Every structure is written in C-alpha cells, then in structure tokens.
C-alpha cells in the first residue's frame, strides 16, 4: 500500500530534477530565440 | 448568481487588477506628497 506512495514520490523527485536541469539550460534556448528575433 | 469559489477567485482577481492599475497609474503618483 505504502509502496505506491514510494514510487509516486520518487517520480515526483525525478520530475523535479528534470525541470531543474531544463531551467539550468534555459538561457541557451532563450539566446537561440533572441538570435532568431 | 453563483456564490461559488469561482466567484470569490473572480472577485479577488478583480481586486488584483484594479490594485495594479491603481499603483501603475499616475493616481498614486499624485497621492504621494511632493515633499
């Protein structure tokens, strides 16, 4: 029963890490967009 | 006539937009004293 909450928490943490990495690289994509502008 | 949480969120949103328009307007610039 608790196991389901365990993997739900670990996917939440993994998603948080993924969006953290995306935010870490975000200035490069924004620089690409402003270059396109 | 709704009287639902959507209504109070709408009223609050109206409060926010009215307040930000008030502050960004020259009305508050006139409100503050020149000194």
């Amino acid at each position: 029963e608790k196991r389901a909450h365990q993997e739900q928490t670990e996917k939440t943490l993994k998603q948080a890490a993924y969006v953290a990495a995306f935010l870490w690289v975000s200035p490069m994509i924004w620089h690409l967009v402003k270059k396109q502008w | 006539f709704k009287e639902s949480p959507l209504y109070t969120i709408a009223l609050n949103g109206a409060f926010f937009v009215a307040g930000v328009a008030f502050i960004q307007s020259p009305l508050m610039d006139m409100l503050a004293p020149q000194l």
Binding site: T9, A16, V19, L23, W30, H31 | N12, G19, I23
Partner: protein
C-alpha cells in the same frame, strides 16, 4: 560556457529575499504586536559588531515577559544567543566559508519540548542561488533519513526575470512514508528597478502574487495576494512612508480590516512606536505601544551616537 558569460546575466536574490521587499518592508505583519513593550538594547562594539538586548513585554501572546539576548557579527562569523524566562534558549550561528557559500545552524530548546534545530547551507553563484535546509535530521537503524528536507534552486533566465523551484521532502517517523512537494517561483524586476513582481505557486495549491512599487525616495506601495474543495483568498494593499524622523506603515485588507504602525524617533536613542488595528467585519481593535532605548557601552561610541 564562454557564451554563458557572454549573456551578462545577473545573480537573482535568495528565495527568502524573493518577496522580502513587500512582506517585510512595505507590510507591517512582522512588525505588528499588541500591548505594551519596552526594548532596552545597548551596543558595545561596532567594527566587530557586538551588542546585547533586554526585552520586557506585557499583554502580548507572542512575546515573552522578559528576554535577554546578545549578538556578535564580525567580518565572516555571526553568532546570536537568546535566553528567555522559563529558561528557553535560542541560538544562531552563520559561518561564511566564502562570500558565495555560507553555512547556518539554528538551535532552539523550550526546556520541556524536544529540541528543534535546523541546518542551512546556501550557495549563491554568479547566476543561480541554491540552498538546502534540514529540520530535525535523523537516520533510522536501516540508514534511512528521517526529518524534513528542503532544497531550493533559483536561476536567472534574463537580467529582468528569474525562475526557479523549491522541493521539500518530509519523513516524520520512517514507518509513515515521506511526502514530497514541488513549488514554482518567479520574479520579474523592472528594467529600471522601479517596480517588482513576484509569484509563487506552492505544492499544496496555494498561490501568492505580490507587486511592489517605489513611488518616490520616501514612499513605497505594494499588493500581496494569497489564495489556497475548500478555497479561500485574501488581498492586502499597503504603503510605507519612510522619512528621516518617523516611519509609517498602513495596510488595507480584503477581510475588511485596517492597520497602522508608526515609529516616532523622538531622540537619537529613544524611539517610541505605536501600532493599531481595526477589524470591521468583527468590529474589534488591537492596540500596542512600546519604546526602544538604543544605548551604548563605550564613551567614544557615546560621542559617535550623539554626533
């Protein structure tokens, strides 16, 4: 990596500083109190900061009857202690390994309740601010962490906008599973630093939106917004009038209440301060008055304080 420096991005403020300029400067929530209060603090040294404080209070729930405290802030180390009647002891220690990386430890014992301590570790690089807080850290016999963990990260997308996250993990006992939560933070600073917007969307569903504007060099204004099925909201507008004699802070609430906080500096040392609040939906009042008597401990510092 060279193109990173080519973007001339600026360091965003700490997460605790995300809305400091509204919830601490313009609004009076942290300064408000009730009843009579006398604060008797004296300064012994300035270049290495060292000063004590006595606090007497009456009629206020949050403040204790008598509280003694002493603090020292040198170039890199900051230590503070506080002893309160019924013998409650609080302590803070901030050590800076470098201007960018800082460690903090906060300890509080109420002498009858479990000791609560929190460990803080923050790092403010040239472009992003990260920090980690551990509340009551503990490890089970199996090697599993038990406590509260918070890890927050804020990255400056552009010199006028910063976006970031804050994650928190909770493990109360180990038998019950540890919950996880993720919150989003956004801050938009004007190109001319005239106005500031700041919005947070927490993991529990509540949203906080704040706006700050510097009307003039002596006046500030702001709006804060909170909204948490069961959904309730609140909208507070406020202004701060700062002068070279007295300071005034006045806020209207969407719950039909008004507040006022006026600190009046009668003397360079002695400073009176009054605060009042009217609640119209309930038709009640809350009044508080008090004084601060900031004195010295050294004769040369007496001359400096008097001019």
């Amino acid at each position: 990596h060279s193109h990173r420096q080519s973007l001339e991005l600026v360091n965003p403020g700490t997460v605790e500083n995300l809305n400091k300029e509204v919830s601490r400067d313009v609004f009076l929530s942290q300064y408000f109190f009730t009843g009579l209060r006398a604060d008797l603090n004296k300064a012994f040294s300035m270049n290495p900061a060292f000063q004590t404080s006595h606090t007497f209070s009456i009629g206020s729930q949050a403040l204790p009857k008598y509280a003694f405290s002493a603090l020292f802030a040198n170039d890199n180390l900051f230590a503070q202690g506080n002893i309160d009647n019924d013998l409650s002891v609080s302590g803070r220690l901030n050590y800076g390994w470098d201007k960018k990386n800082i460690s903090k430890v906060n300890l509080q014992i109420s002498d009858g309740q479990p000791t609560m301590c929190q460990l803080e570790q923050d790092y403010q690089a040239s472009d992003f601010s990260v920090n980690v807080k551990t509340l009551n850290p503990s490890f089970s016999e199996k090697g599993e962490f038990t406590g509260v963990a918070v890890a927050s990260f804020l990255q400056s997308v552009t010199p006028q906008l910063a976006l970031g996250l804050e994650t928190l993990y909770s493990r109360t006992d180990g038998s019950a599973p540890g919950d996880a939560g993720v919150s989003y933070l956004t801050r938009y600073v004007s190109k001319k630093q005239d106005w500031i917007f700041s919005g947070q969307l927490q993991a529990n569903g509540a949203l906080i939106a704040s706006l700050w504007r510097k009307v003039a060099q002596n006046v500030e204004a702001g709006i804060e917004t909170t909204l948490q099925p069961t959904v309730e909201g609140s909208t507070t507008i406020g202004a701060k009038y700062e002068y070279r004699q007295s300071v005034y802070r006045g806020t209207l609430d969407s719950n039909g209440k008004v507040a006022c906080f006026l600190e009046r500096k009668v003397l360079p040392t002695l400073s009176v301060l009054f605060c009042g609040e009217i609640d119209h939906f309930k038709n009640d009042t809350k009044i508080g008055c008090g004084l601060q008597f900031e004195t010295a401990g050294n004769q040369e510092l007496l001359m400096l304080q008097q001019g």
